[PDB]
Design a protein around this ligand. Structure first.
Ligand SMILES: O[C@H](c1cc(C(F)(F)F)nc2c(C(F)(F)F)cccc12)[C@@H]1CCCCN1
Ligand SMILES: [Mg+2]
Ligand SMILES: [Mg+2]
Ligand SMILES: [Mg+2]
Ligand SMILES: [Mg+2]
Ligand SMILES: [Mg+2]
Ligand SMILES: [Mg+2]
Ligand SMILES: [Mg+2]
Ligand SMILES: [Mg+2]
Ligand SMILES: [Mg+2]
Ligand SMILES: [Mg+2]
Ligand SMILES: [Mg+2]
Ligand SMILES: [Mg+2]
Ligand SMILES: [Mg+2]
Ligand SMILES: [Mg+2]
Ligand SMILES: [Mg+2]
Ligand SMILES: [Mg+2]
Ligand SMILES: [Mg+2]
Ligand SMILES: [Mg+2]
Ligand SMILES: [Mg+2]
Ligand SMILES: [Mg+2]
Ligand SMILES: [Mg+2]
Ligand SMILES: [Mg+2]
Ligand SMILES: [Mg+2]
Ligand SMILES: [Mg+2]
Ligand SMILES: [Mg+2]
Ligand SMILES: [Mg+2]
Ligand SMILES: [Mg+2]
Ligand SMILES: [Mg+2]
Ligand SMILES: [Mg+2]
Ligand SMILES: [Mg+2]
Ligand SMILES: [Mg+2]
Ligand SMILES: [Mg+2]
Ligand SMILES: [Mg+2]
Ligand SMILES: [Mg+2]
Ligand SMILES: [Mg+2]
Ligand SMILES: [Mg+2]
Ligand SMILES: [Mg+2]
Ligand SMILES: [Mg+2]
Ligand SMILES: [Mg+2]
Ligand SMILES: [Mg+2]
Ligand SMILES: [Mg+2]
Ligand SMILES: [Mg+2]
Ligand SMILES: [Mg+2]
Ligand SMILES: [Mg+2]
Ligand SMILES: [Mg+2]
Ligand SMILES: [Mg+2]
Ligand SMILES: [Mg+2]
Ligand SMILES: [Mg+2]
Ligand SMILES: [Mg+2]
Ligand SMILES: [Mg+2]
Ligand SMILES: [Mg+2]
Ligand SMILES: [Mg+2]
Ligand SMILES: [Mg+2]
Ligand SMILES: [Mg+2]
Ligand SMILES: [Mg+2]
Ligand SMILES: [Mg+2]
Ligand SMILES: [Mg+2]
Ligand SMILES: [Mg+2]
Ligand SMILES: [Mg+2]
Ligand SMILES: [Mg+2]
Ligand SMILES: [Mg+2]
Ligand SMILES: [Mg+2]
Ligand SMILES: [Mg+2]
Ligand SMILES: [Mg+2]
Ligand SMILES: [Mg+2]
Ligand SMILES: [Mg+2]
Ligand SMILES: [Mg+2]
Ligand SMILES: [Mg+2]
Ligand SMILES: [Mg+2]
Lengths: 131, 386, 63
RNA sequence: AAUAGGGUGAAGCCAGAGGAAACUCUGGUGGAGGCUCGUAGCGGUUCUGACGUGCAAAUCGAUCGUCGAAUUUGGGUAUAGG
RNA sequence: UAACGAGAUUCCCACUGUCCCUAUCUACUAUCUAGCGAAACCACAGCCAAGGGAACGGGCUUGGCAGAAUCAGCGGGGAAAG
RNA sequence: AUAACUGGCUUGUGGCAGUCAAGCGUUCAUAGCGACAUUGCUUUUUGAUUCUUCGAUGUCGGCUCUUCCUAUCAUACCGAAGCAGAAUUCGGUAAGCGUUGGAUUGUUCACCCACUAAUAGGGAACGUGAGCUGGGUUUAGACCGUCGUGAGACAGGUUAGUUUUACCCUACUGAUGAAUGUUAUCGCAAUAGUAAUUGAACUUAGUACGAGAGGAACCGUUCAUUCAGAUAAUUGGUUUUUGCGGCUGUCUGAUCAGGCAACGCCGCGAAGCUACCAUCUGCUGGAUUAUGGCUGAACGCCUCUAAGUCAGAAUCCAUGCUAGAACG
């Protein structure tokens, strides 16, 4: 439920990002990106605000070894906003959510990209500083 | 056997051959279709690509996430001094296409346009158009007769106009002479307009209005001989491939026992003729105005020129056109600006542009000042200032 | 449009110029170019960098 | 006839500490080994690199094995086509 | 089975243009010039489609067509060369 | 004269498609199927044969790239239903346009994970090795198991094993060019090519439909995927600007200023080049296919059809875009 402009992709398949919620996961390993079409040899890749299918590589045992949705909330790859500003964070981070985009955990450490907060009201609810 | 996996074509088959343009001046392949009920007006203009800049603009697009909010946008500056009308051509509809019937010229042609007809001007006697200038002897009824022939027989009337390249910073002294089709009114009206405009200047503000969508005809940047990887964007072969990797591995099946016209091959890249459409006019600036770069919100008396001039062009001291985005060609390239070939009523086409601010920092580096006065105020007195 | 100030060198940032850096503690730094951006990621001290405005004010030059 | 410079630190030897004894523990010294890192040297793993009508009828470059012995090598000498 | 291994294999950390997905730079070539100057190969040669044919033609039959002389590349064909 | 590839005849076998209509489908042969039979097509399987090649046509697979077929997976438009809606199934015109990222295996094949509108099937000497690679097979080294007295065999397992040449002709991609009095400028347009693609969100609307559960669509708006053509504002990358600064060793007696370290090293670094790693741009008319119709006979009724005619698909031809016939 939103229409975000194109952003520089930061997280190809196989990337491991930080998990920024208190759900108990410490890693989030990207294995797919929602909405990725077909192109030979091209890896699916995610930007901030993208829904991703991920597994927990490092974390609580009941969160590990499962496929689960997650939403990327910040990226260290610089990207340009329509107001001309190129910005980036120190790391790539995401949060575990439902297929509907509703967070499983209930608290986010660190800033959240405005594209993600504008696009996911739940993450906006659980977010502190929004950039 | 079939491809193991499917993939789209590399490159467009609608732009073959990828060869050099026959001329450096891009030529208008097609002019806007003539409607008699409109007034008599030019349909194209010639200008010179000066450089690119940046603007800030409030977007007026309801339903957008940037609506009523500032956007930062790239813009292109086209130096466009007024063109001089020197001739008129009549065209006749024939079962083989349009055919030029007659060309009538003005009595006096300027030196920059008379240089167009010479390869070695300094070695010439400069005899061009002297007997034709004599054709005007005291009644010029032969000339009116040719104009009457155009009125009687021509169906398409085009004017001959040349740029005043001496008003630009270019070191070239040859003017650029082009045919610009006249639309509107009857053929007699078009011929009368051309005659009354012989040896007169026509400005951009008489051809293009603000918020228009216009097309740009130009020859692109030349890159010389280029391989398939950058000419056609094909996949590089693995690192460990013998005899090199910037190639297309299979250039054909065994049969047909020939190389097909559709296989990507190394060859000349760039310097192609392109027509790029739907570039919005953000500003038709005036050369006499000392506040070219000023807006209604930034009243700093400021020209469009960056500090130190446009890099590898110079200063734009003439009337100019500020276009949205990028246009084909390089700096100093002659660019043909053509009116649109259709009527666009989309919100992007009918939006009214109001500029907030125009970037005039140096393009020769990471410029951080908009004006020498601002630079002085920021840095204070220097040793060289005494 | 408003003009920002470089967190490192203190020079004016005009629309579209430079980059914005969000630190892990949610603090925002603005750099006009890759020069000050590189010195910032290189951990340089603007009080010890002779050309910044902060340096000039620390040494009371042009005041 | 030839084989930089380091590391490790075996026997043998000297001294101290702890105890009734049995003895144990510790600090030095010493300089062993078909030991080890690594030059010269000998070899030739990988790039399946270069070259591949070559510089060369086997070479070139990087990388690599080994480098005090079952080591490397000159000359003299012996063994000759079932 | 400790130790050892340019032996074969799997996983993990670090690392990276291996890759997403490519871009840029340097020297030597290639290129052009003066001088010097080979070789493989060669029935005759050299545009296609279909047909028939030793059942996949440069030549034959029927069509498409077809305008001197050429340069850099290239690797579809010459069922190319060895 | 004769096997192991391709190709050729054949098409048993493999694959695909008909017709008949006993039954299935609460009733009901034919919405969807369809036994017993029977007629075909294909050469993407495997056989049969041995016609070409043994003075050699480089024999697996993958990577890369182009094109073609349609027996259509998706997308456009439609007809049918055991089609209320949503979903789905059967069918028509249709190849314009797309058909993916990975774990294991040398694999073709397979099998899972995941995205997607969809992850359709094939051909081009089982496309493609002077394009690559060389994991497999299929020289010579070696090990094992079974077999053999043995040398040795295995279509069984395992490990290591040189992949040569284009400068010729043609063809493709670009680049010049004699002559059609000379030279110059501006043009026309025959012919050839062609380009865009798909999704999501908001609204319609919790509306139509439905007892409820559930639950659409057209007009419109904002974005996005894949592709295409440019461009260098900005941001990033690149650095022989060896531009500026810094650092080690050594050399010029010291200083200043320099040389060398097979660009000595490091930070920044303009300009240039360049990135869905950046930005911009990607048109509107006509004629039709399937199909649904009008008037209207044949056949005093009926009938979209016989004469005539209307609308109508991602189709076709133009508009537009690229080249410009080097003998228009
Ligand atoms: O040992 C030679 C040899 C054979 C073969 C093979 F038959 F397998 F293809 N390949 C060889 C190769 C090969 F190309 F690597 F396969 C290299 C050197 C000698 C080879 C033989 C000896 C008998 C005469 C033919 N060459
Ligand atoms: Mg792949
Ligand atoms: Mg296919
Ligand atoms: Mg295609
Ligand atoms: Mg280049
Ligand atoms: Mg190789
Ligand atoms: Mg610049
Ligand atoms: Mg930079
Ligand atoms: Mg030693
Ligand atoms: Mg040893
Ligand atoms: Mg050793
Ligand atoms: Mg050595
Ligand atoms: Mg060697
Ligand atoms: Mg080799
Ligand atoms: Mg060679
Ligand atoms: Mg001897
Ligand atoms: Mg050994
Ligand atoms: Mg094993
Ligand atoms: Mg033929
Ligand atoms: Mg035959
Ligand atoms: Mg045949
Ligand atoms: Mg044959
Ligand atoms: Mg034949
Ligand atoms: Mg022949
Ligand atoms: Mg003939
Ligand atoms: Mg030639
Ligand atoms: Mg070649
Ligand atoms: Mg060939
Ligand atoms: Mg021959
Ligand atoms: Mg056969
Ligand atoms: Mg059959
Ligand atoms: Mg059968
Ligand atoms: Mg029944
Ligand atoms: Mg045979
Ligand atoms: Mg026989
Ligand atoms: Mg033969
Ligand atoms: Mg043979
Ligand atoms: Mg032969
Ligand atoms: Mg051969
Ligand atoms: Mg061959
Ligand atoms: Mg074979
Ligand atoms: Mg069909
Ligand atoms: Mg269908
Ligand atoms: Mg097609
Ligand atoms: Mg076949
Ligand atoms: Mg084959
Ligand atoms: Mg080949
Ligand atoms: Mg080969
Ligand atoms: Mg092969
Ligand atoms: Mg092998
Ligand atoms: Mg063997
Ligand atoms: Mg036995
Ligand atoms: Mg093997
Ligand atoms: Mg080996
Ligand atoms: Mg045409
Ligand atoms: Mg609603
Ligand atoms: Mg491009
Ligand atoms: Mg220096
Ligand atoms: Mg020094
Ligand atoms: Mg010296
Ligand atoms: Mg030296
Ligand atoms: Mg030096
Ligand atoms: Mg840099
Ligand atoms: Mg730069
Ligand atoms: Mg777009
Ligand atoms: Mg009727
Ligand atoms: Mg009909
Ligand atoms: Mg009819
Ligand atoms: Mg002709
Ligand atoms: Mg011509």
């Amino acid at each position: 439920s939103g229409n975000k402009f194109r952003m520089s992709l930061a997280l190809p398949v196989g990337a491991v990002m930080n998990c920024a919620d208190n759900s108990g996961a410490r890693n989030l390993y990207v294995l797919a990106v929602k909405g990725t079409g077909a192109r030979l040899n091209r890896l699916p890749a995610a930007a901030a605000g993208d829904m991703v299918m991920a597994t927990v590589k490092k974390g609580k045992p009941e969160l590990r070894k499962k496929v689960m949705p997650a939403i990327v909330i910040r990226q260290s790859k610089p990207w340009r906003r329509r107001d001309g500003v190129y910005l980036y964070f120190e790391d790539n981070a995401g949060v575990i959510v439902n297929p509907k985009g509703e967070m499983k955990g209930s608290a986010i450490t660190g800033p959240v990209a405005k594209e993600c907060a504008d696009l996911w009201p739940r993450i906006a609810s659980n977010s502190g500083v929004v950039v | 056997s079939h491809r193991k996996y499917e993939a789209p074509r590399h490159g467009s088959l609608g732009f073959l051959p990828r060869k050099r343009a026959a001329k450096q001046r891009g030529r208008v392949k097609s002019f806007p279709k003539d409607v008699k009920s409109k007034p008599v007006a030019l349909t194209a203009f010639l200008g010179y690509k000066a450089g690119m800049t940046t603007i800030v603009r409030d977007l007026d697009r309801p339903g957008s996430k940037m609506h009523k909010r500032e956007v930062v946008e790239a813009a292109t500056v086209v130096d466009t001094p007024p063109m001089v009308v020197v001739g008129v051509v009549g065209y006749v509809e024939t079962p083989r296409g349009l055919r030029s019937l007659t060309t009538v010229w003005a009595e006096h042609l300027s030196e920059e346009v008379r240089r167009r007809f010479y390869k070695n001007w300094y070695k010439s006697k400069k005899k061009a158009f002297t007997k034709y200038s004599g054709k005007y002897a005291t009644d010029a009824k032969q000339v009116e007769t040719e104009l009457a022939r155009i009125k009687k027989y021509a169906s398409v009337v085009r004017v001959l106009a040349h740029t005043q390249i001496k008003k630009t910073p270019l070191s070239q002294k040859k003017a650029h002479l082009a045919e610009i089709q006249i639309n509107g009114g009857s053929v007699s009206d078009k011929v009368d307009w051309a005659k009354e405009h012989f040896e007169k200047e026509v400005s951009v503000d008489s051809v293009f209005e603000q918020d228009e969508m216009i097309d740009v005809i130009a020859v692109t940047k030349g890159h010389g001989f280029e391989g398939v990887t950058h000419r056609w964007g094909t996949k590089k072969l693995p690192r460990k491939t013998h005899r090199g990797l910037r190639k297309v591995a299979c250039i054909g099946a065994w049969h047909p026992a020939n190389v097909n016209w559709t296989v990507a091959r190394a060859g000349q890249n760039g310097y192609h003729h392109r027509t790029s459409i739907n570039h919005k006019v953000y500003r038709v600036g005036k050369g006499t105005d000392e506040a070219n770069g000023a807006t209604e919100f930034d009243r700093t008396k400021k020209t469009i020129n960056p500090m130190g001039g446009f890099v590898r062009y110079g200063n734009v001291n003439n009337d100019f056109v500020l276009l949205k985005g990028s246009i084909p060609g390089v700096k100093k390239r002659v660019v043909t600006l053509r009116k649109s070939l259709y009527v666009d009523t989309s919100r992007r086409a009918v939006e009214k542009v109001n500029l907030k601010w125009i970037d005039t920092a140096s393009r020769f580096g990471k410029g951080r000042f908009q004006t020498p006065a601002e630079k002085h105020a920021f840095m204070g007195t220097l040793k060289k200032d005494l | 449009m408003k003009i920002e100030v470089d967190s490192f060198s203190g020079s004016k940032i005009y629309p579209g110029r430079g980059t914005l850096f969000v630190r892990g503690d949610s603090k925002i730094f603005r750099f006009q170019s890759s020069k000050s951006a590189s010195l910032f990621q290189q951990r340089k001290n603007p009080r010890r960098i002779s050309w910044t405005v902060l340096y000039r004010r620390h040494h009371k030059k042009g005041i």
